[PDB]
Amino acid sequence: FAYLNARVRVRRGTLLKESFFQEALDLSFADFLRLLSETVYGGELAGQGLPDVDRAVLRTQAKLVGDLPRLVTGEAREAVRLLLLRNDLHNLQALLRAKATGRPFEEVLLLPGTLREEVWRQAYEAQDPAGMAQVLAVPGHPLARALRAVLRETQDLARVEALLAKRFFEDVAKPALRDYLALEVDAENLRTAFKLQGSGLAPDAFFLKGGRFVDRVRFARLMEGDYAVLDELSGTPFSGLSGVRDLKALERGLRCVLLKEAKKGVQDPLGVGLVLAYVKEREWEAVRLRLLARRAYFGLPRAQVEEEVVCP
């Protein structure tokens, strides 16, 4: 961990200050590009369009975040590799969902992971899930194996997403990181229960153990249609999910929960906590840059955007 932390410390200095996001919320697209060009992202910013901003973010994070697993070994590599693979899971699910709805690749948020954007593009270009698996296999990604396995059991979008997650977390199971991972399990159970709500499927076939606040009862209740479960979490990190009745709002709240938990890591400068915080802060950075770039580009409502780029 000493080495990984050194490499992380070397990179924390280029994290964007909160002042950047505050100013960006009210900038024209041209000025947004100007502000961005002065940050570490400037090196990869080669154009004047929205896709140029998205590309600069992806390429910059591939070199400041995505490569971390290749720099170390032992338990240190395990920790950061695990975090990035979890994002690859999110990316695959997002791609599967986009394809199922015929949404453009440009609309898919890609979190910092272990794969190059070109691989994800090839997967999106694939004719079907099976085709996506072959693409992921080239770089030897574990999702290629998980996807092939899930597909010989079901083709239903929602179930595929849930089973992919179930396999990932089961492999995960086999301090700061333990605490954080338990919250990731809680959050995954909440999104799965929401996605499979009213399906009538056996909750135990989808419940992930290893969480902390989202017990099998809370999971089953939400999956069987009780939204009130989300209003009963006031004494937990998930208190902000009260009133949530749509998947969009749920994902928003879940991101803030995990971000806050990860930031506790700064308290562990010599341990896994530092990289945990660094990776999640870069993720939040990527998410906000994407949303702020779109507000400036399209001229989106300030109030709606502000709510999506601020975490109470």
Joined tokens for residue 112: 């910092």
For residues 253 and 232, the answer to whether their CB atoms sit within 8 Å is no
Asked if residue 217 and residue 152 are part of one domain, the reply reads: no
CA distance 126 to 130: 8
Asked if residue 233 and residue 159 are part of one domain, the reply reads: no
In 3D space, the residue among 310, 300, 312 whose CA is nearest the CA of residue 21 turns out to be 310
CATH code for the domain in which residue 275 is found: 1.10.132.50
Query: Of 130, 152, 174, which residue sits at a domain end?
Result: 174
Its domain, for residue 118, covers: 74-174
Joined tokens for residue 199: 């399906």
For residues 282 and 67, the answer to whether their CB atoms sit within 8 Å is no
For residues 24 and 32, the answer to whether their CB atoms sit within 8 Å is yes
This entry's atomic model was obtained through X-ray
Asked if residue 222 and residue 162 are part of one domain, the reply reads: no
Query: Of 174, 205, 236, which residue sits at a domain end?
Result: 174
Asked if residue 113 and residue 93 are part of one domain, the reply reads: yes
Residue 60, classified by CB atoms within 10 Å of its CB into exposed (0-12), middle (13-18) or buried (19+), is buried
Asked if residue 161 and residue 98 are part of one domain, the reply reads: yes
Joined tokens for residue 9: 């410390």
Residue 40, classified by CB atoms within 10 Å of its CB into exposed (0-12), middle (13-18) or buried (19+), is middle
Residue with tokens 């109470």: 312
Q: Which distant-in-sequence residues (6+ apart) come within 8 Å of 199 by Cβ?
A: 158, 223
Asked if residue 262 and residue 291 are part of one domain, the reply reads: no
Q: Please count the structural domains in the chain.
A: 3
For residues 33 and 48, the answer to whether their CB atoms sit within 8 Å is yes
Asked if residue 164 and residue 83 are part of one domain, the reply reads: yes
Asked if residue 79 and residue 69 are part of one domain, the reply reads: no
CATH code for the domain in which residue 120 is found: 1.20.1690.10
How many whole angstroms from its chain centre is CA 183? Answer: 13
Query: Of 123, 145, 174, which residue sits at a domain end?
Result: 174
Asked if residue 85 and residue 159 are part of one domain, the reply reads: yes
Asked if residue 254 and residue 265 are part of one domain, the reply reads: yes
